[PDB]
């Protein structure tokens, strides 16, 4: 999969989409639909479907929803307030977690200002907490902005 601070973005396009194989697969731990209840998806047509992908903790799946707050929805991935799609989530302990700790899945924990909806930020500048210029070096009130 893809990190949480640089999510992916696939633009599904002209095709025959069958959201029933999704809806009834029973392998998903969370399948919420917001603009439109799930059973009526296989009876409507749009212009574009986007699919974003990433990996988070287990109890941060409640911040992937319109109108939430927290380190994920504030500055990692923000959903607009009139969302239309659906959110799907499933546990993946056996694939992504490895003995000794899988330190390849990072997230951003400091930013100047919360994200605009569907905005993305992969920069890696030293977060300047204190007025003292960080000069690009760590220290008190000068923090690296990514945690794992």
């Amino acid at each position: 999969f893809a990190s949480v601070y640089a999510w992916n973005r696939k633009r599904i396009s002209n095709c025959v989409a069958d959201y029933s194989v999704l809806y009834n697969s029973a392998s998903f731990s969370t399948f919420k639909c917001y603009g439109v209840s799930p059973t009526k998806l296989n009876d409507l047509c749009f212009t574009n479907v986007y699919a974003d992908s990433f990996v988070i903790r287990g109890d941060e799946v409640r911040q992937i929803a319109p109108g939430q707050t927290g380190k994920i929805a504030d500055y990692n991935y923000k959903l607009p307030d009139d969302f239309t799609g659906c959110v799907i989530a499933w546990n993946s302990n056996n694939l992504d977690s490895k003995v000794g700790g899988n330190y390849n899945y990072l997230y951003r924990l400091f930013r100047k200002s919360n994200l605009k909806p569907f905005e993305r930020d992969i920069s890696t500048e030293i977060y300047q907490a204190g007025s003292t210029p960080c000069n690009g070096v760590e220290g008190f009130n000068c923090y690296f902005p990514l945690q794992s």
């Epitope: 924990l109 400091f110 930013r111 907490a129 204190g130 007025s131 003292t132 760590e138 008190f140 794992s148």
Partner: antibody, heavy 122, light 114 residues
């Protein structure tokens, strides 16, 4: 959970060396700077912040220099402190704290070690 | 450099009173629009590790009831606990922030009536 566990309430003789441990839990560890303070019998505190999650250059308080050494282990996230050449008036209690931060600027120390004892005297 | 001289000491006054603990040195307003402050208030019970009280100087108490209440300015400020009650008897230090070290000293006890 948000915890800090110290150990090593002990006694030393002057002109010696000591290592003191702080065990952490309930956090990513390498993400918040560890800061130790001194405290005599009914007095104030000192020792400026230092050390960081990754590598960390580490700082000092400029009257404690040379005797002070800060070593940790990425095996569980346990910060330590090595003092040397004790002079039998550094007998005090020694603390740990996580120094938590939040968007704007960190706000005081997150937790607070349980403290420890070092008693120097022949 | 920045010395946090606290004036009052042993405010052993009848519970409920309104203590006023002042201290200052060498302002730390801290630019960056973040015009807030730079120093927390602390509470250390005797025979106990310290705890956290008002920070940013900005009343920002955490799991802490309202009677403990801060204030702030550029150089000078005060903690000012209201309606004090039994078990607030402690030692109350200050901070410095970007400075380096710390500095503070205060406490209370009782007074009685007789």
């Amino acid at each position: 959970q948000v915890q800090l566990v110290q150990s090593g309430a002990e006694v030393k003789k002057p002109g010696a060396s000591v290592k003191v441990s702080c065990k952490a839990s309930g956090y990513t560890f390498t993400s918040y700077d560890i800061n130790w303070v001194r405290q005599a019998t009914g007095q104030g505190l000192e020792w400026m912040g230092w050390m960081n999650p990754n590598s960390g250059n580490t700082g000092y308080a400029q009257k404690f220099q040379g005797r002070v050494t800060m070593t940790r282990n990425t095996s569980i996230s346990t910060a330590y402190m090595e003092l040397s050449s004790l002079r039998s008036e550094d007998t005090a209690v020694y603390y740990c704290a996580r120094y938590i931060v939040v968007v704007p600027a960190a706000k005081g120390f997150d937790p607070w070690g349980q403290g420890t004892l070092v008693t120097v005297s022949s | 450099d920045i010395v946090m001289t606290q004036s009052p000491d042993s405010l052993a006054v009848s519970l409920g009173e309104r203590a006023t603990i002042n201290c200052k040195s060498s302002q730390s307003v801290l630019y960056s629009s973040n015009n807030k402050n730079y120093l927390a208030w602390y509470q250390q019970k005797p025979g106990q590790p310290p705890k956290l009280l008002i920070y940013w100087a900005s009343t920002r108490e955490s799991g802490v009831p309202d009677r403990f209440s801060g204030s702030g300015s550029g150089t000078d400020f005060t903690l000012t606990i209201s309606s004090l009650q039994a078990e607030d008897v402690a030692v109350y230090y200050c901070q410095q922030y970007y400075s380096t070290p710390l500095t503070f000293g205060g406490g209370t006890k009782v007074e009685i009536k007789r």
